[PDB]
C-alpha cells in the first residue's frame, strides 16, 4: 500500500521564521496530498488541499510546493499560534493514509 | 418511368413502434427500422436496429416473414401487354434474407409525384415444382 | 479501428457503439500483446471465436490505472458505481493497456472528467452525460460559492513524470447479449484447404456430409447453394470460398 | 453554520458492540462522504473506515471485517458500529465531511473510546 512519512517530524523555530515540512510519499500520489493542522485537544484543520492552493478561511501565510513523491509546506509568516501537529493524506485514494506528523514549538 | 419507389412493412408504421422501411433510390437501395411519422398520403417529389444497402417492365415481388427472416423475391421479365399481367410462367429468385425480427401485419407502397400495381395474398398450398435441367423452375401445378 | 481510434470518450460520458453485421477477430485481439490487462468473465477468449452472439456493445473510456481493478463485474467504487456500473451477471471481456505516451502530456490533461460526486449509485450500463451544476442541490439558487454542493465533474491529473499507476490506462469493456434474434456479429470461420478426389469428411456451411468431392459439370443458378438428387440425397455442393 | 458533534465514547468489553453517534448540522448524510478516522493518545491520526454517498463501504486493512458502518437517515445522524474490539483500538474517533478530492474541511468533536477488560 501507499505509505507516507514526514521528516524530521520534530522542528523547533521562533516566530517569523520560514519552516518547511516535507511529506515524501513512499508511492506516487501525484499532487493529491492534503495538509492538516491538529492542535492538541482539538480536531485537525486543513490548510492545503490537493495541489498547492489555499483553503477558504485559512491565512494567506500558508503555501505549498512540489508534486509527485515530494511535497513542502511553506509558511511565510510564522505566527505564534500556528504551532501544532501537521498531517499529510492522499486525497484521491480509496485507502487514505496519514503522515507521521511534525511538532512545532517555541525556540 | 418507375413511379413505384418504396415499401413499408410495420404493425404500426406511424412512429408508434419499430417498423421495417424500404426506400428505393437510383443511387442505392435503402432499408431501415427507425420509427417515422407519415401522413395518410405521403407523396414524393420529382432508433434503427437494422440496416442494409444494395409498360415494358413488370417488377414482381414476394414478401414473407418466417422464422424471424424477412424474405424478398423478384423477377423483372419484360411484358408487352399493357392491359393485365400476361398468361405464362416466370419463377421468382430470392434477393434478400435480412433478419429484421420485427413482426409485420400491415403493408403500404410509396409513389412519386411531379402506374397500376397488383397485390396478391399467400397461403399454405402444396405445389409441384418442375425443375429444368439447369435448375430453374419452368412449370408448376397446384 | 475503435481501439486504434485517436479520440476516446471520457469515463463519465463513455461512448456507446453498437456493433452489428460483421465479424471480429477475438483470436487476434487476445494474441495482441499491447494489452496489459485482458480479463474475460463471460466467455474465455480461447472459445470466444467459437461462441456466437447477436449484439456487441463497446464502451470506450479512459480511466486512471488504479481504477482498472474497480472496473469489473460485481465491483464497488467511485468509478465502478458513479459513472460506469456493470451487472452482477456479466457476459464479456475487459481490456486494458498502458496509455502514458498516447494521451498523457506535459500539461494537465483536463479533457477527461470523472463523476466525483453523485447522490446514488447508477444502474448497470447507464450513462449520466448531464453536466448538472451542483450534485447535492441543497438550495436551487445555484450559488457560485457552493458550500454543501459541488461540481460532480473534475479533471484528471495526468502527468508522465509520475509513472506509478496514476497514469491513464485505456479500458474498453464488451457486452455480449442473447436477444433471441438472429446473429449479426459472430466469430471468424476457419476454412481448411479443400481437397478433391479423396474420400474426405466435409462440412460445407452445415452440410456435414461424408464423401469424395470431384470437380463437377452441372451449372447452378447464381443463388443456389447446393444440389440435390431425386431421393433427396445431396450430390453437389457449391464451394463458398 | 455547520457543526459536527461526536459522541458515544466509553468503556466496553472485548467482543462487544457499541453504536458510535455523530450529529451533523447543515449536511445531508444521504449525499455525503462520511469517513471515520481515529487518533490514539500519543499518536497521530489513522484511517479506520469509509462509506460513500450511496453505499460501497470501505475498511482499513487492520480493522477489515471487524468493523461495520451503517449511517441512518433519521436526522442525518452518522453512525459507526463496532464488533470484535481490542485493547489497541482505544482512540478518539472523528467525523468527516463530503469532500473527497477538494480536501476535508471539518471533523467531529471526538470522544475517546477506552477498550479494556
Ligand atoms: C432518396 O430518397 C429520398 C426519400 O426520402 C428522397 O427524398 C430523395 O430525393 C432521394 N434521392 C436522394 C439523392 O436523396
Ligand atoms: C427503439 O425503439 C423505440 C424507439 O423509441 C424504443 O423502445 C427504444 O429507443 C428502442 N427499442 C429497442 C427495443 O431497440
Ligand atoms: C408477432 O406479433 C405479435 C403481436 O401480436 C408479437 O407479440 C410477436 O412478438 C411477433 N413475433 C415476432 C417474431 O416478431
Ligand atoms: C439449359 O442450358 C443453358 C444453361 O445456361 C441455357 O442457356 C439453356 O437455355 C437451357 N436449356 C433448356 C432446354 O432449358
Ligand atoms: C475470398 O472469398 C471470395 C469469394 O468469392 C473469393 O473470390 C476470394 O478469392 C477469396 N480470397 C480473397 C483474398 O479475396
Q: Which residue from B86, B87, B52, B57 is spatially nearest to B74, judged by alpha carbons?
A: B57
Does A72 touch chain D if contact means CB atoms closer than 8 Å?
A: no
A 43-82: CB under 8 A from C: 51, 67-68
- The ligand that comes nearest to the alpha carbon of residue C238 is 5
Cβ distance B2 to B109 under 8 Å? no
Ligand nearest to the CA of C179: 2
Closest alpha carbon to C70 in C81, C58, C61:
C81
- Does residue A3 contact residue D47 with C-beta atoms inside 8 Å? no
Closest CB from C182, C220, C224 relative to B101: C182
Alpha-carbon gap, residue A23 to A31, rounded angstroms: 12
Q: Do D31 and C135 count as a contact with CB atoms less than 8 A apart?
A: yes
Counting ligand 2 atoms within 8 A of each CB, the residue from B12, B16, B36, B47 with the most, and so the one to mutate, is B47
Q: List chain C residues with CB under 8 Å of D55.
A: 76, 81, 121
| Exposed / middle / buried, residue C79 (Cβ in 10 Å: 0-12, 13-18, 19+) | buried
Helix (H, G, I), strand (E, B) or coil at A23: strand
Nearest to A24 by CA among A90, A93, A71: A71
For ligand 4, whether the C-beta of B132 sits within 6 Å is yes
Q: Cα(B91)–Cα(B60) distance, rounded to whole angstroms?
A: 10
Contact assessment for residue A34 and residue D104, using Cβ atoms and an 8 Å cutoff: yes
The minimal CB distance from B134 to the residues C21, C219, C223 is found for C219
Residue identifier of the C-alpha nearest atom 12 of ligand 3: B103
Q: How many CB atoms lie within 10 A of CB B123?
A: 5
Resolution (A): 3.2
Cis peptide bond N-terminal to A8, omega within 30: yes
> In this structure, which ligand is nearest to the CA of B12?
3
What residue ranges in D51-117 does DSSP mark as E strands?
58-59, 77-81, 91-94, 111-113
Provide φ and ψ at A102, rounded to 5°: -120, 150
Give the integer Cα–Cα distance in Å for C122 and C106. Answer: 34
* Three cell numbers written together for A15: 516566530
Sign of the C-alpha dihedral computed for residues C161, C164, C166 and C171 taken in this order: positive
Q: Take residue A24 and report the three cell numbers written for it.
A: 515524501
Please answer whether residues A46 and A57 qualify as being in contact, where contact means their C-beta atoms are separated by less than 8 angstroms: no
Q: HSE on the CB side for D55, CA within 13 Å?
A: 9
Question: Where in chain D are the domains?
Answer: 3-113
Task: Evaluate the CA torsion angle C176, C182, C186, C190 in order and state its sign.
Answer: positive
* Among the listed residues A87, C76, C136, the one whose alpha carbon sits nearest the alpha carbon of residue D107: A87
* Under 8 Å between Cβ of B46 and B115: no
Q: How far is the CA of C195 from the centre of ligand 4 (A)?
A: 30
CA distance C38 to B32: 36
All three cell numbers of C110, joined, read 483536463
CB C168 within 8 A of CB C64: yes
For A4-106, the fitting CATH number among 3.40.50.10490, 3.40.50.720, 2.60.40.10, 3.40.50.2300 is 2.60.40.10
- Closest ligand 2 atom to residue B35 Cα is 4
C-alpha cell at A25: 510519499
C184 phi/psi in degrees, rounded to 5: -120, -40
Q: Are B64 and B122 in contact (CB under 8 A)?
A: yes
Burial of C241 (0-12, 13-18, 19+ CB in 10 A): exposed
Instruction: Identify the residue among D6, D44, D98 best suited for mutation to test binding to A, counting A beta carbons within 10 A and taking the highest.
Output: D44
Q: Is the CB of B3 under 6 A from ligand 1?
A: no
Report chain breaks in chain C, C–N > 2.5 Å, as residues after which they occur.
none
Q: Judging by beta carbons within 10 Å of its beta carbon (0-12, 13-18, 19+), is residue B133 exposed, middle or buried?
A: exposed
- Number of neighbouring beta carbons within 10 Å of residue C159: 20
CB A99 within 8 A of CB A87: yes
Cα C135 to chain centroid distance, Å, stands at 31
CA–CA gap between residue D98 and residue B44 (Å, rounded): 60
Q: Is D59 helix (H, G, I), strand (E, B) or coil?
A: strand
Q: Is-contact C222 C230, C-beta < 8 A?
A: no
Q: What CA–CA distance (Å, rounded) separates B120 from B106?
A: 14
> B134: CA distance to ligand 4 center in Å?
6
Q: For D64, which DSSP code?
A: T
Q: Which residues is B50 bridged to in the sheet? A: none
HSE at residue C160, side-chain half, CA atoms within 13 A, is 10
Residue with CA closest to ligand 4 atom 7: B134
Interface mutation vs chain D, best among C136, C145, C149, most D CBs within 10 Å: C136
Which residues are within 8 A (CB) of C159 and not within 5 positions of it... i.e. 6 or more apart? A30, A67, A68, C104, C106, C108, C166
Q: What is residue A98's DSSP assignment?
A: B
- Kindly provide the residue ranges of all beta strands, DSSP E only, lying in A1-107, ordered along the sequence: 6-7, 10-13, 20-23, 33-38, 45-48, 62-65, 72-75, 85-90, 102-106
DSSP A80: T
Assess whether the C-beta atom of B14 lies below 6 angstroms from ligand 2: no
DSSP secondary structure code for residue D12 in this structure: B
Whether the CB-CB separation of B29 and B5 falls below 8 Å is answered with no
Size of interface A-D (CB pairs under 8 A): 60
DSSP letter (8 states) at residue C197: S
Report the alpha-carbon distance of residue D80 to residue D34 in Å, rounded: 10
> Exposed, middle or buried: residue B35 (CB in 10 Å: 0-12, 13-18, 19+)?
middle
Smallest Cβ–Cβ distance between C138 and the set D28, D56, D99 belongs to: D28
Residues 6+ apart with CB under 8 A from C233: none
Touching chains, C (3+ CB pairs < 8 A) = A, B, D
Chain A meets chain B (3+ C-beta pairs below 8 A): no
What contacts 24+ positions apart, CB below 8 Å, involve B111-115?
A: B111/B3, B111/B4, B111/B5, B111/B43, B111/B44, B112/B2, B112/B3, B112/B5, B112/B43, B112/B44, B112/B45, B112/B46, B113/B43, B113/B44, B113/B45, B113/B46, B114/B45, B114/B46, B115/B3, B115/B4
Report the 3 state secondary structure along D19-76.
EEEEEEECCCHHHCCCEEEEECCCCCEEEEEECCCCCCCEECCCCCCCCECCCCCHHH
Residues with CB under 6 A from ligand 3: B 68, 103
d(CA B73, CA B67): 17
Q: Kindly report the three-state secondary structure assignment for every residue of chain B.
A: CCCEEEEEECCCCCCCCCCEEEEECCCCEEEECCCCCCCCCCCEECCCCCCEECCCECCEEEEEEECCEEEEEEECCECCCCCCCCCCCCCCEEEECCCCCCCCCCEEEEEEECCCCCCCCCCCCCCEEEECCCCCEEEEEC
Please indicate if any CB of chain C lies within 8 Å of the CB of A31: yes
Q: Are C5 and C62 in contact (CB under 8 A)?
A: no
Query: What's the alpha-carbon Rg for chain A, to the nearest Å?
Result: 13
CB contact under 8 A, D31 and C78: no
What method did the depositors use to determine the structure?
cryo-EM
H helix runs in chain C, sequence order? 26-31, 45-48
In CATH, the number for domain D3-113 is 2.60.40.10
Q: Is B23 in the pocket of ligand 1 (CB under 6 A)?
A: yes
Partners of residue D109 on adjacent β-strands: none
B44-45 and B107-113 strand pairing: parallel
User: Do C158 and C169 touch, CB atoms closer than 8 A?
Assistant: no
Domain ranges of chain A: 4-106
The contacts of residue D27 (CB under 8 Å, 6+ apart) are C148, D2, D4, D76, D97, D98
**Residue whose entry in the numeric block shows the C-alpha cell 520560514:** A18
C-alpha cell recorded at residue C89: 451477471
Question: CA C71 to CA C94: how far, in whole Å?
Answer: 8
Amino acid at each position: 500500500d501507499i505509505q507516507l512519512t514526514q521528516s524530521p517530524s520534530f522542528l523547533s523555530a521562533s516566530v517569523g521564521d520560514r519552516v518547511t515540512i516535507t511529506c515524501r510519499a513512499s508511492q506516487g500520489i501525484s499532487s493529491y496530498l492534503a495538509w492538516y493542522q491538529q492542535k492538541p485537544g482539538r480536531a485537525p484543520k486543513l490548510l492545503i488541499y490537493a495541489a498547492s492552493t489555499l483553503q477558504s478561511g485559512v491565512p494567506s501565510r500558508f503555501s505549498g510546493s512540489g508534486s509527485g513523491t515530494v511535497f513542502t509546506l511553506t509558511i511565510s509568516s510564522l505566527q505564534p499560534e500556528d504551532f501544532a501537529t501537521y498531517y499529510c493524506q492522499q486525497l484521491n485514494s480509496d485507502s487514505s493514509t496519514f503522515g507521521q506528523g511534525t511538532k512545532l514549538e517555541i525556540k | 418511368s418507375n413511379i413505384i419507389r418504396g415499401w413499408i412493412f410495420g404493425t404500426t408504421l406511424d412512429s408508434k413502434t419499430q417498423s421495417l422501411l424500404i426506400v428505393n433510390n437510383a443511387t442505392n437501395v435503402v432499408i431501415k427500422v427507425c420509427e417515422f411519422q407519415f401522413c395518410n398520403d405521403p407523396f414524393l417529389g420529382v432508433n434503427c436496429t437494422f440496416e442494409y444497402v444494395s409498360f415494358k417492365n413488370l417488377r414482381e415481388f414476394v414478401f414473407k416473414n418466417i422464422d424471424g427472416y424477412f424474405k424478398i423475391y423478384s423477377k423483372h421479365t419484360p411484358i408487352n401487354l399493357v392491359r393485365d399481367l400476361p398468361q405464362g410462367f416466370s419463377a421468382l429468385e430470392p434477393l434478400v434474407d435480412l433478419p429484421i425480427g420485427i413482426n409485420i401485419t400491415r403493408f403500404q407502397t410509396l409513389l412519386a409525384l411531379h402506374a397500376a400495381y397488383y397485390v396478391g395474398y399467400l397461403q399454405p398450398r402444396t405445389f409441384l415444382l418442375k425443375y429444368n435441367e439447369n435448375g430453374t423452375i419452368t412449370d408448376a401445378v397446384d | 479501428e475503435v481501439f486504434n481510434a485517436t479520440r476516446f470518450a471520457s469515463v463519465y460520458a463513455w461512448n456507446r457503439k453498437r456493433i452489428s453485421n460483421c465479424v471480429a477477430d477475438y483470436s487476434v485481439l487476445y494474441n495482441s500483446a499491447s494489452f496489459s490487462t485482458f480479463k474475460c468473465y463471460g466467455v474465455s477468449p480461447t472459445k470466444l471465436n467459437d461462441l456466437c452472439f447477436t449484439n456487441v456493445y463497446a464502451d470506450s473510456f479512459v480511466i486512471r490505472g488504479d481504477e482498472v481493478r474497480q472496473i469489473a463485474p460485481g465491483q464497488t467504487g467511485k468509478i465502478a458505481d458513479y459513472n460506469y456500473k456493470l451487472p452482477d451477471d456479466f457476459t464479456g471481456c475487459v481490456i486494458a493497456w498502458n496509455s502514458n505516451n498516447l494521451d498523457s502530456k506535459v500539461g494537465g490533461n483536463y479533457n477527461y472528467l470523472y463523476r466525483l460526486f453523485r447522490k446514488s449509485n447508477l444502474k448497470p450500463f447507464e450513462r449520466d452525460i448531464s453536466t448538472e451544476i451542483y450534485q447535492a442541490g441543497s438550495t436551487p439558487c445555484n450559488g457560485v460559492e457552493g458550500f454543501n454542493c459541488y461540481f460532480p465533474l473534475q479533471s484528471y491529473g495526468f502527468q508522465p513524470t509520475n509513472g506509478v499507476g496514476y497514469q491513464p490506462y485505456r479500458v474498453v469493456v464488451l457486452s455480449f447479449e442473447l436477444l433471441h434474434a438472429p446473429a449479426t456479429v459472430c466469430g471468424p470461420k476457419k476454412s481448411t484447404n479443400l481437397v478433391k478426389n479423396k474420400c474426405v469428411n466435409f462440412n460445407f456451411n452445415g452440410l456435414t456430409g461424408t464423401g469424395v468431392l470431384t470437380e463437377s459439370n452441372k451449372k447452378f443458378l447464381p443463388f443456389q447453394q447446393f444440389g440435390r438428387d431425386i431421393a433427396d440425397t445431396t450430390d453437389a455442393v457449391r464451394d463458398p470460398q | 453554520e455547520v457543526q459536527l458533534v461526536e459522541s458515544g465514547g466509553g468503556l466496553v468489553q472485548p467482543g462487544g458492540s457499541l453504536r458510535l453517534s455523530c450529529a451533523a448540522s447543515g449536511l445531508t448524510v444521504s449525499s455525503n462522504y462520511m469517513r471515520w478516522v481515529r487518533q490514539a493518545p500519543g499518536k497521530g491520526l489513522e484511517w479506520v473506515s469509509l462509506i460513500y454517498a450511496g453505499g460501497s463501504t470501505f475498511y482499513a486493512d487492520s480493522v477489515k471485517g471487524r468493523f461495520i458502518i451503517s449511517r441512518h437517515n433519521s436526522k442525518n445522524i452518522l453512525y459507526l458500529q463496532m464488533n470484535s474490539l481490542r485493547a489497541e483500538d482505544t482512540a478518539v474517533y472523528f467525523c468527516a465531511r463530503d469532500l473527497y478530492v477538494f480536501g476535508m474541511d471539518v471533523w467531529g468533536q471526538g470522544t475517546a473510546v477506552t477498550v479494556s477488560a
